[PDB]
Amino acid sequence: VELQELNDRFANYIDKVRFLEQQNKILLAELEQLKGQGKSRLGDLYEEEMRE
C-alpha cells in the first residue's frame, strides 16, 4: 500500500491521459461540428438560396 498509493499515483497520471483523451474527444467532436456546420452546411444551403 506503499505500493498502492503507488499504482494509483501512476493511475491518476494515466487518468490525466484519459482526461485529456476525453477533453480532446469533445474537442474532436466539436471540431467536426464546426467544419460540418460553419463552412459546409451553412454554405451549402445559402449558396442554393442565392441561386434561387
Binding site: 499515483r9 491518476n12 497520471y13 490525466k16 485529456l20 477533453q23 480532446n24 469533445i26 474537442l27 466539436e30 471540431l31 461540428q33 464546426l34 467544419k35 456546420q37 460553419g38 463552412k39 451553412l42 454554405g43 445559402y46 449558396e47 438560396e49 442565392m50
Partner: protein, 51 residues
C-alpha cells in the same frame, strides 16, 4: 414597367442574394470563432494531479 417591375424584383433579390452570400461568409468565419474555442479546449492541457 418590364424594366421597372423586373428591376424592383432584382434590386430586392440582389440584396437577399448578397445577404445570403454574406451569411455564408459570416458562417465560414464563425467556423474560425468556434476554432478559437476549440483552441482553448486544446490549451487546457495544463494543470496538476488532483488530491
Amino acid at each position: 414597367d418590364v424594366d421597372n417591375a423586373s428591376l424592383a424584383r432584382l434590386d430586392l433579390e440582389r440584396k437577399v442574394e448578397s445577404l445570403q452570400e454574406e451569411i455564408a461568409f459570416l458562417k465560414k468565419l464563425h467556423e474560425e470563432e468556434i476554432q478559437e474555442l476549440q483552441a482553448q479546449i486544446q490549451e487546457q492541457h495544463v494543470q496538476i494531479d488532483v488530491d
